[PDB]
Amino acid sequence: MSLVYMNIMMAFTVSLTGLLMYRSHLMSSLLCLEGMMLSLFILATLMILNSHFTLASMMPIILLVFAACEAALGLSLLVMVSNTYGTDYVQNLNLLQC
Amino acid sequence: AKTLLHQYWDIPEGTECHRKTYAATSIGGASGLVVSAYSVALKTPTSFLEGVARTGRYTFTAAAIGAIFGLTSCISAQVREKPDDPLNYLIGGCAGGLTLGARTRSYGIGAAACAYMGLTAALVKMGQLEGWKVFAEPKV
Amino acid sequence: KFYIQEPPHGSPNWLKVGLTLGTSAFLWIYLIKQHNEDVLEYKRRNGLE
Amino acid sequence: ARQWQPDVEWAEQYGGAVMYPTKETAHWKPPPWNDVDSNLTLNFGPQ
Amino acid sequence: MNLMITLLTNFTLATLLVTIAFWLPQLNVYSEKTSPYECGFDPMGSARLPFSMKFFLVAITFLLFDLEIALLLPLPWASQTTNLNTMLTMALLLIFLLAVSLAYEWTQKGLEWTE
Amino acid sequence: MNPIILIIILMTVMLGTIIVMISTHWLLIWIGFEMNMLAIIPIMMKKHNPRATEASTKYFLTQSTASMLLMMAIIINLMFSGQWTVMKLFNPMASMLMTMALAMKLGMAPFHFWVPEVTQGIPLSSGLILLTWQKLAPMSVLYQILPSINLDLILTLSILSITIGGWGGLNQTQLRKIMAYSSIAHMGWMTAVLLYNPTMTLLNLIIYIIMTSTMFTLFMANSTTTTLSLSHTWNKAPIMTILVLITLLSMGGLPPLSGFMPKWMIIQEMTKNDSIILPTLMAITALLNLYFYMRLTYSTALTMFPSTNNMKMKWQFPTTKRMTLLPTMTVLSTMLLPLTPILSILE
Amino acid sequence: MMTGRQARAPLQFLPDEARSLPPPKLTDPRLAYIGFLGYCSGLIDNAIRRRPVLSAGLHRQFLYITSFVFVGYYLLKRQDYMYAVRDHDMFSYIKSHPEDFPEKDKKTYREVFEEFHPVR
Amino acid sequence: MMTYIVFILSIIFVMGFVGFSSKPSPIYGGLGLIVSGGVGCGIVLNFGGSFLGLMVFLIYLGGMMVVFGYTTAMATEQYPEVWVSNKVVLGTFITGLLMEFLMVYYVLKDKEVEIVFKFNGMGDWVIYDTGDSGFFSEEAMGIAALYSYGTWLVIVTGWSLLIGVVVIMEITRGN
């Protein structure tokens, strides 16, 4: 295909390996998730802008929009842990094993 | 891993020994790496050294399993001079079962493994002979 | 007067059973009418009268 | 004489956290029955 | 290209002032001028303790209202469209959805503060 | 929970499922999936417990990873194909990423590491809503893209799902983990036949939904979440023991019950393609599932466990709970065998 | 696999061709079995709510029987419509392609060779 | 090495992504992703996407200003690590930078790498158009027909954002 496509998809899988290997913090994983979505948005916008698809130009930003509509939910899924545990370490999140 | 099995089956059986033995050893090594990676994934090793010790243990055990299985099949098919007979693969399956019992330090496990992967090796051999398909393509 | 209180199901709610009877009658009448419409439309569609 | 019925030993055999207690699942307590499980000191100083 | 030149010139002028402010005068430091400032006394603990912040929902709903802004922002070019009725009806609909979210926040006690 | 807000939440999750059902666009598919996520999330947090928060965090993280993989598959398909129609895909790697996304969303093994904790940490009605309503939209997406599905990948995932579900269900005392591993086994049985005849997949999905909803309704009626309380149900009512026995016999796979109806015909659509050893292996793991089902039936109905003295108070009050269509779903889960050819309505 | 037939015109329970088929009679054994299913469902409601099983709520039993018979009749209509569509597409394709499906000359037993294995 | 401006911006994108993918601390991860988003917005502006680049800029600034407020509110440790205060953070950062330079050296040498798909070493400007779109920009009418052509999409987006508001209100109630 090209070169910047390779760079963007490699950034996506780099951020995927960042998310799929935790480092004892939930919000850092949320940041990696938003990075994966950044790579997705950048790839989609570049693909459209190369292919002159005008009417599909709504799809990137709306994609972006919906990501925030879940990302805040992840933040809303953080303080509740902070309302039960003192911190937000994932190794403390092992109550569901019995 | 689609080429290891085919390279195992690309050589006529019971004709040459070391290449078939090393092909089976490589298949066993790939399986051992897969199972050891899963074992260190779901179960946390206490240290890096103990984790790589477990990985090497599973790799060595599965490599010995594959090497002895391929070897025993090779000398069995050479001695009986019967390439199209699954009894050689049953004998190799019991050889692998004795290997598993030796590396795991058990005897009843060795006999059960004899029976179980001897039957598995026989099923593989008549699957090759009769052309059975594990994953049949859709026809109707 | 056996029970100390009045149970909710100790009295026949006539509206509920009337609605159930009306719904059952409507379903049966619609079923026979649909069956008749189907059978004479079948005899019309093939001329097997 | 009559039909055998389960005693407290059978029922407490079925009462474990897991069906077959292994070497790892020894501290696994059963879940609860009802499914229910530093303010900042600031000095307004003189300056 | 000119935007890049302006950015580089602005960054060069910014980072030249701190370098002038740092390596020109004479430095003389002890282990009290570098101490944290707590109005003349020692700090009680560290500032890395978790703040019991009370407007978490206000920050999240600021994010959500900014995405409402992102939906409402390409409206001027939609003024040049042909199908004006659908444009006006749905711009009013989206503004009404924003107002519905704000009114639900108002009624269900969200714009106030915790504790 | 507010009843109006709860009704709005339920209308949102059903609207998201309907949007996934009816859309001919990949972006609208993902929008419906996101709405499904965002509406099912507060259903699990109806009780405000730490277990619910842990389950919600695990579910949200896994489904977010699945959603991002789905978006990358969609973008790859767009870039190699130039359109957005929901049909066969034009790249094997996009097919890989979408298959992993749908396997993560469904809970199929080896991505089964989130279903039992999520089912355990949430109440029974939320577990019903999860294990029934989340298995409709990914099945529709897999129904749409079955030309592009790799055969070896889906068959390996299916056999791994059935084996892992049986081996998981052999060693769980909690009812909800039993339900989760049984759901994994039914998922593997249902998705093994997808490439040969998707009507069999739809039929097995319908029967599994009916039986699982029947069992969760019986658990809600008895208000029991443990094996010992389920055994203690014999003193409260004998009819509940009769229905739990006949239903858990139905999900085992015994004739002439309805649970023998799908699985047997799965073989009827796999011997036509000359696949012989795979239905035999899946029948053996179905026997394993029947084994842990038989242990559970021995616990609840066929042997009456000792009870306590408090239950006499419960003898003075009838069950005032609302059993939603319980006899109809029990009858459909038990005696649907003589109406076997009715699956032809699903064509 | 009939989706192509349900491709041009969707979400139709009974299309226009379904009216040209003979509808199932009310004395069909399948309809009687579904009515028995509804009667059993009514008995289960009389059982599980601690009511008398054979006399309590005749309106509920009649409603169950009627609803079961209604949905069973419509599902059986859809079933026989789909099976007729299957056989009609079958015969249409077997008229359409005679080159890929030839005829067979059924030989007599006076000349076809068979191997006899003795049992002893 | 002039017309590789898109390549250079993409390399800074991958560098920042490797930098914040180590997950050292939410503030420093936000800084690394913000550098990455800045050069990604630069990519989109260099491809003519003024509105999309500025929109992703503004959205990311708002979202991780909120993330900054949250990590300074609750998710904080006593001694946050920058990049070198812990061993595995620096290890995976150096590892990711080494693989980044690995395919940099792979793509500037043979001009055709094969990672899943095949990739070329020329800049993307070769695919950009030679025609002129008159007195207008096409993406502007894309986001303008967002309101006229885009009926179902805008309806479901607004309903999903309203549902997000009501869900986020319902989650952090406690009772």
Swiss-Prot record, chain A:
InterPro entries found in the cross-reference section: NADH_UbQ_OxRdtase_chain4L/K (IPR001133), NUOK/Mnh_C1-like (IPR039428)
Catalytic activity, reaction form: a ubiquinone + NADH + 5 H(+)(in) = a ubiquinol + NAD(+) + 4 H(+)(out)
Taking the first listed entry, what is the main subcellular location of this protein, grouped into a coarse class? mitochondrion
Instruction: Please report the record's description of how this protein sits within the membrane.
Output: Multi-pass membrane protein
> Pfam family of this protein, just one?
Oxidored_q2
Any single Gene Ontology cellular-component annotation? respiratory chain complex I
**Tree of life domain:** Eukaryota
State its location(s). Answer: Mitochondrion inner membrane
Which GO molecular function terms does the record list?
Answer: NADH dehydrogenase (ubiquinone) activity
Q: What does this protein do?
A: Core subunit of the mitochondrial membrane respiratory chain NADH dehydrogenase (Complex I) which catalyzes electron transfer from NADH through the respiratory chain, using ubiquinone as an electron acceptor. Part of the enzyme membrane arm which is embedded in the lipid bilayer and involved in proton translocation.
* Similarity remark: Belongs to the complex I subunit 4L family.
How this chain assembles, per its entry, is:
Core subunit of respiratory chain NADH dehydrogenase (Complex I) which is composed of 45 different subunits.
Under what name is this protein listed?
NADH-ubiquinone oxidoreductase chain 4L
Give the gene name.
Answer: MT-ND4L
Curated annotation (Swiss-Prot), chain E:
Give yes or no: UniProt keyword Transport.
yes
Q: Which reaction does it catalyse?
A: a ubiquinone + NADH + 5 H(+)(in) = a ubiquinol + NAD(+) + 4 H(+)(out)
> What keywords does the record list, in alphabetical order?
Electron transport, Membrane, Mitochondrion, Mitochondrion inner membrane, NAD, Respiratory chain, Translocase, Transmembrane, Transmembrane helix, Transport, Ubiquinone
Gene Ontology biological-process entries:
mitochondrial electron transport, NADH to ubiquinone
Q: Which residues cross the membrane?
A: 3-23, 55-75, 84-104
Q: Which Pfam families match?
A: Oxidored_q4
Q: How does it sit in the membrane?
A: Multi-pass membrane protein
UniProt keyword Translocase, yes or no = yes
**Enzyme Commission identifier(s):** 7.1.1.2
One GO term describing the cellular component? mitochondrial inner membrane
Q: Which GO terms describe its molecular function?
A: NADH dehydrogenase (ubiquinone) activity
Predominant cellular place of this UniProt entry's protein: mitochondrion
Q: Subcellular location, in the record's words?
A: Mitochondrion inner membrane
Paired cysteines (S-S): none
Which protein family is named in the record? Belongs to the complex I subunit 3 family.
| Subunit architecture | Core subunit of respiratory chain NADH dehydrogenase (Complex I) which is composed of 45 different subunits. Interacts with TMEM186. Interacts with TMEM242.
**What job does the chain carry out?**
Core subunit of the mitochondrial membrane respiratory chain NADH dehydrogenase (Complex I) which catalyzes electron transfer from NADH through the respiratory chain, using ubiquinone as an electron acceptor. Essential for the catalytic activity of complex I.
Specify the protein name: NADH-ubiquinone oxidoreductase chain 3
User: What is the organism field in this record?
Assistant: Ovis aries (Sheep)
Swiss-Prot record, chain F:
Q: What is its EC number?
A: 7.1.1.2
Which UniProt keywords are given for this protein, alphabetically ordered?
Electron transport, Membrane, Mitochondrion, Mitochondrion inner membrane, NAD, Respiratory chain, Translocase, Transmembrane, Transmembrane helix, Transport, Ubiquinone
Per the annotation, which location comes first and is thus the protein's main one? Answer: mitochondrion
Gene Ontology annotations of biological process type? mitochondrial electron transport, NADH to ubiquinone; mitochondrial respiratory chain complex I assembly; reactive oxygen species metabolic process
Question: What's its membrane topology?
Answer: Multi-pass membrane protein
Q: Where are the transmembrane segments?
A: 3-23, 25-45, 67-87, 96-116, 122-142, 145-165, 178-198, 200-220, 237-257, 274-294, 325-345
- Which reaction is the catalytic activity of this chain? a ubiquinone + NADH + 5 H(+)(in) = a ubiquinol + NAD(+) + 4 H(+)(out)
Q: Where in the cell is it found?
A: Mitochondrion inner membrane
Q: What class of enzyme is it?
A: translocase
Q: How does it assemble?
A: Core subunit of respiratory chain NADH dehydrogenase (Complex I) which is composed of 45 different subunits. Interacts with TMEM242.
According to UniProt, the name of this protein is NADH-ubiquinone oxidoreductase chain 2
Swiss-Prot record, chain H:
Gene Ontology CC terms, in alphabetical order: mitochondrial inner membrane; respiratory chain complex I
The GO annotation for biological process reads: mitochondrial electron transport, NADH to ubiquinone; mitochondrial respiratory chain complex I assembly
Q: Name one GO molecular function term.
A: NADH dehydrogenase (ubiquinone) activity
Matching entries from Pfam families are given as: Oxidored_q3
Q: What is its main location?
A: mitochondrion
Keyword annotations for this protein? Electron transport, Membrane, Mitochondrion, Mitochondrion inner membrane, NAD, Respiratory chain, Translocase, Transmembrane, Transmembrane helix, Transport, Ubiquinone
Q: Which domain of life is it from?
A: Eukaryota
| Transmembrane portions of the chain | 1-21, 25-45, 47-67, 88-108, 149-169
Name the top EC class.
Answer: translocase
Q: Which reaction does it catalyse?
A: a ubiquinone + NADH + 5 H(+)(in) = a ubiquinol + NAD(+) + 4 H(+)(out)
Localization of this protein = Mitochondrion inner membrane
Enzyme Commission (EC) number:
7.1.1.2
Q: How does it sit in the membrane?
A: Multi-pass membrane protein
Gene3D superfamilies per UniProt: NADH-ubiquinone/plastoquinone oxidoreductase chain 6, subunit NuoJ (1.20.120.1200)
Quaternary structure and interacting proteins, as annotated? Core subunit of respiratory chain NADH dehydrogenase (Complex I) which is composed of 45 different subunits.
Q: What does this chain do?
A: Core subunit of the mitochondrial membrane respiratory chain NADH dehydrogenase (Complex I) which catalyzes electron transfer from NADH through the respiratory chain, using ubiquinone as an electron acceptor. Essential for the catalytic activity and assembly of complex I.
**Family (UniProt):** Belongs to the complex I subunit 6 family.
This one is known as NADH-ubiquinone oxidoreductase chain 6
Q: Which organism is it from?
A: Ovis aries (Sheep)
Phylogenetic placement of the source organism: Eukaryota, Metazoa, Chordata, Craniata, Vertebrata
